[PDB]
């Protein structure tokens, strides 16, 4: 019997062995089609023990994925160049930047955090406009694990996600950590009609989600801003 923790799966190996006189079994931890770890555990283990045998590897993978796909940071500096006044984490670049060094001609500059800086001079009202427009949700790093073609705004290239992609955000094992019931209440549906979406295969009574419901759900969970 498998165990499912979000997009991860833990399976046994169908024929045990005797190590030290006691019967054991090999277990494998998968992330989609990629095998990550293998352990040998005895029997008389409940499923919670098999869970927290691998919990640390799960947490480390979460830490690395969070650090790698972190969004970019802009900052607001005065006319000298140092003494950053405020920071903001954006999800896109404001498209007018070109490599700059601040001088005394203007009292406010908006630079990047990367080292060969790009920058722009602002006047504290357009800065608020850019902060409103280009900001990033608190869980924007989950978008680094998604295929992109399920994330576009254009309706012509979009395709509905599969169940394995959909388990990245919904379910108690997912990275948001939200339930199916709470996500169903977030969309104004029943729990059963929402469970219809996450069956596993469309032949076994499963429907695709809509474009609008998918983007609105990504909006309400704080993953994609979806203006």
């Amino acid at each position: 019997n498998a165990i499912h923790i979000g997009p991860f799966s833990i399976t046994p190996a169908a024929r045990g062995l005797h190590y030290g006189g006691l019967p054991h079994h090999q277990w494998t931890l998968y992330y989609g089609p990629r095998e990550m770890a293998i352990k040998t555990l005895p029997d008389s283990y409940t499923s919670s023990e098999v869970r927290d045998e691998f919990s640390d590897i799960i947490a480390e993978f979460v830490i690395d994925a969070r650090h790698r796909y972190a969004p970019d940071v802009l900052e607001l500096v005065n006319s000298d160049g140092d003494a950053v006044l405020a920071r903001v984490a954006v999800s896109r670049l404001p498209e007018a930047l070109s490599g700059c060094i601040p001088d005394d001609r203007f009292p406010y500059w908006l630079l990047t955090a990367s080292r060969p800086r790009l920058g722009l001079p602002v006047t504290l009202n357009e800065y608020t406009a850019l902060a409103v427009e280009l900001s990033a949700p608190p869980l924007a790093w989950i978008t680094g694990l998604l295929p992109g073609e399920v994330l576009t705004h254009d309706a012509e290239e979009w395709r509905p996600p599969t169940s394995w992609e959909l388990r990245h955000v919904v379910g108690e094992g997912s990275f948001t950590g939200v339930s199916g019931a709470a996500a169903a209440a977030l969309l104004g549906m029943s729990a059963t009609n929402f469970r219809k979406y996450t069956a596993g295969d469309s032949a076994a009574n499963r429907q695709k989600i809509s474009f609008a419901a998918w983007h609105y759900l990504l909006d309400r969970l704080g993953v994609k801003r979806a203006s």
Partner: protein, 335 residues
């Protein structure tokens, strides 16, 4: 009644060594015993972003920012010396025989039925067809994978070694024999019947193979690669290593073994696409597609289970396929 065994395993035949690389000058190929080895080195590379972007055209400034801070890596490389124009690759091959018998089993009646089926096959035909195809794959230098591409003239040379000396030599032009079809020629048939004599258990055979390829001075050769797991992420400096045994560039054995058993022409899809290597659910990772899907009754497992348990033979080409899969060896059990 008479089910399949739960555990069942076969040892491989046609064991190759590893291939060793060395360089020298053409028309000195008859005196190639002191040719120096090819060594791997390191060099630096700086490159920019060249893949598809995840978001297509929503951010040009991110593209310029990625350009202004490019990527730096360290990379292994193998070259010929700047005064030699010929690669030399040398390995040995051992044929065993005793093809039917597994190395592990559960039911005695299962393995008895199995080896009497194999005895019937070997009584109908010899190993002559499979040995012909193997000698054809050995004639052209297919085991030079990328180093064969765009070469000028490539010639192989096989010796038969019984005591510490050579029994019979062969020479070929590997560009005469294409990678597309299986012809006949008397030297190739003599080699093929030697292979079939080795496969039958009628006697041991040991061959050594040497291939020369005229490439050009200072050009690039291609050994096998290795694993750079969890090492190209923190700084990403080292990013490619080549396999080398005792500071000489080398190819893995199983790459040569994969190059030898590309003889399967009987897969149901087409025949204008050339032979492939044998496999249960015969698949090519370079195309991401498995011929002999289990839906059609042309994979290895259903063919074997039909031949042994329901006791009807498939077509003779499918008998060639299942016998070649038994020659390859592996683990066949309930997983």
């Amino acid at each position: 009644i008479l089910s399949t065994a739960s555990v069942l395993a076969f040892e491989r035949k046609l064991d190759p060594s590893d291939a060793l690389m060395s360089a020298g000058a053409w028309a000195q190929r008859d005196a190639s015993q002191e040719w120096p080895a090819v060594t791997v080195r390191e060099k630096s590379v700086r490159g920019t972003i060249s893949n598809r972007l995840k978001t297509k055209d929503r951010d040009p400034a991110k593209l310029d920012a990625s350009i202004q801070s490019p990527n730096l890596q360290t990379v292994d490389v193998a070259n010929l010396p700047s005064d030699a124009d010929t690669l030399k690759v040398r390995f040995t091959l051992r044929v065993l025989g005793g093809a039917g018998t597994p190395s592990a089993c559960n039911d005695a009646a299962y393995r008895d039925k199995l080896l009497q089926t194999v005895a019937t096959y070997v009584n109908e035909q010899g190993f002559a067809e499979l040995a012909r195809r193997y000698a054809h794959n050995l004639a052209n230098a297919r085991f030079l994978w990328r180093n064969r591409v765009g070469a000028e003239a490539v010639e192989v040379r096989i010796n038969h070694i019984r005591q510490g000396e050579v029994a019979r030599t062969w020479r070929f032009d590997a560009l005469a024999i294409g990678l597309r079809d299986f012809k006949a020629d008397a030297e190739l048939d003599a080699l093929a019947e030697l292979i079939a004599s080795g496969l039958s258990g009628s006697g041991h055979v040991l061959l050594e193979v040497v291939a020369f390829a005229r490439i050009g001075d200072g050009q690039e050769v291609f050994p096998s690669q290795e694993l750079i797991l969890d090492k190209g992420d923190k700084k990403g400096q080292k990013s490619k290593t080549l396999y080398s045994v005792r500071d000489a560039a080398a190819i893995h054995s199983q790459k040569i073994g994969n190059a030898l058993r590309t003889i399967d022409t009987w897969y149901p899809d087409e025949d204008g696409l050339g032979p492939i290597a044998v496999e249960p659910y015969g698949s090519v990772t370079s195309q991401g597609k498995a011929y002999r899907q289990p839906k059609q009754k042309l994979d290895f497992y259903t063919l074997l289970d039909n031949w042994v348990l329901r006791d009807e033979a498939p077509a003779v080409e499918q008998q060639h396929y299942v016998i070649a899969n038994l020659i390859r060896g592996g683990v066949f059990g309930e997983a």
